Amino acid sequence: KVNEFLSGFTKFEWLCKESIQESIKKFSKNGPTLQNYEDQLKKFSQIEEEIEKIVPTYKIGAMELMTHNICTSLSTWAKEWKLQYSQDLHKRARQL
Predict the structure, then answer these.
(1) What whole-number distance in Å separates Cα of residue 55 and Cα of residue 46?
(2) Alpha-carbon gap, residue 79 to 58, rounded angstroms
(3) Which of 3, 33, 74, 96 is the residue whose CA sits 20 to 30 A from 11?
């Protein structure tokens, strides 16, 4: 049951791979539009919505889990991409 939770949450673990700078740099090399940047910010806010959606806290048999730790991890991981987006926005302004 833990692993079922974990499988539902691999999509959220995607943060760990996406946190690499190379992914955001490939997407930035794509030269996306302002609407695209806004779409990533919005998908990011939706990620945050899922981060607060840590409702499952069922005691796994006779074991109680610490979900707030996971939530905090996800939130920090998250914040990474927003700071990345601000820093690339500034250099777009620079070049153009």
Answers:
(1) 16
(2) 27
(3) 33
How many other C-beta atoms lie within 10 A of the C-beta of residue 63?
A: 8
Q: At what angle do helices 10-18 and 34-52 cross, to 10 degrees?
A: 130
Resolution (Å units) = 8.0
For tokens 């048999």, the residue is: 61
Locate tokens 């820093």: which residue? 87
Q: Is 63 left (phi over 0), alpha (psi -120 to 50) or beta?
A: beta
| Structure-determination technique | cryo-EM
DSSP assignment string, 42-94: HHHHHHHHHHH--------SS----HHHHHHHHHHHHHHHHHHHHHHHHHHHH
